[PDB]
Amino acid sequence: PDYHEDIHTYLREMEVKCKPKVGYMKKQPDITNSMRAILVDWLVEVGEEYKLQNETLHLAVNYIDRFLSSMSVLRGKLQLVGTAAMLLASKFEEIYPPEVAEFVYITDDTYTKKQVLRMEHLVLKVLTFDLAAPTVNQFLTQYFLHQQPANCKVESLAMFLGELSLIDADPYLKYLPSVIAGAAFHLALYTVTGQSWPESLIRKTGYTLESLKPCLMDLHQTYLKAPQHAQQSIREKYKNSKYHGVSLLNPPETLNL
């Protein structure tokens, strides 16, 4: 595609403007990372329950973090912000989104339909309608076109690792999505085949295996600890044969850096 490079450059320009604040959680007086992790985990179930695209999920998480970057939110209203975000994401990415009623339904009438509709409106003001955010999922898609041959266990597993990173704001909030996606691809490739971050992609991204190292270290930890984590929605998801069961594969015990 004649624009495929332009897109990549343009996605790299946009990821910097869509960045949440680094340490927003600690000026947030009533909530924390641990409860952000419960929310996001919940969002994975809602996506599975309604057969949403993975992208809708990445989008919603971007909106939530950007919103919590400038608004204090009480714990009893956290789920409302998340549920409004998943609605906007679905409206943006899905061919036909689930009705508001269904979004009200998954909360157990913990909020009313109007409350959701007013939150949608509030989220839209705060993000000033900037909904077209680049996501780890997007860069992975671009990176996959540089694999020989196409190996779909590596694709599934790189997706899987990128989803895990949604759950924990510390540390993953301090990496751009292009970096997390690089780290996930290397790690997935390394794990299935013993291969390495290809030259084609170093040339494309200007990212050496060496500049991935800090993020690749974290993702190795995460991958290793994954069966132990409080949140398990994602592992549940990636056991499906639809993902070639990559959630079941054994992480390697060293990165060999």
């Binding site: 929310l39 919940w42 909360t107 913990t110």
Partner: peptide, 4 residues
């Protein structure tokens, strides 16, 4: 489910 409700949730925190």
């Amino acid at each position: 489910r409700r949730x925190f």
